[PDB]
């Protein structure tokens, strides 16, 4: 339970980083070389690709923040979690659901995400 | 949104199948030969073992029901819904939320399922 908010929190504070290279940093720790990410927007693979893709979609989105929803959960290498989009003012624009799948070294391999209203 | 309905609806029809046999024939249809299934409680793979994987699961929850909640979404192969376990007297019990995978060629490929309470 706790290594599955871990993972969110994880997951979460590389899409929230504001510095490019500290980001670039958490991904080479957090993810796998052989890592792949799809959401119904996007797509990226390679800790490279992942870390340039997070960059992109906030710079359509700056100043916008996500925020866990509920407690995560899982099973086996599996995490589940939700998170809510934060407009620069506060509110509340949307959100999204996220699995991730680690790999036998504790590094994410695998992310499917969805949206949210 | 209706390619994902449907992947749903034809999902639940398998686990809510009375009899043995005609969910062979469901699981046969739908799911792919290499498919892969993992939930918090069990796990399969291929059609045979999906097939029984359901039976036993069944087998342990008499009268049970698999009821769809909300409206399924995805994108790309990948469709997401959310189900309800309903109780023989009709009472929620609990609940489910299902990631599914179809290959090329339409078929289920790969599974992962999460439980939820209300």
Redesign the interface.
Known sequence: MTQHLTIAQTYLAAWNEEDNERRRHLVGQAWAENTRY???LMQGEGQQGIAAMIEAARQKFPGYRFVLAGTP????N?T?FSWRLISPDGDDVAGG?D?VSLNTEGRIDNV?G??DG
């Open positions: 799809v959401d119904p959960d899982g099973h086996g599996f589940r659901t699995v499917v969805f949206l």
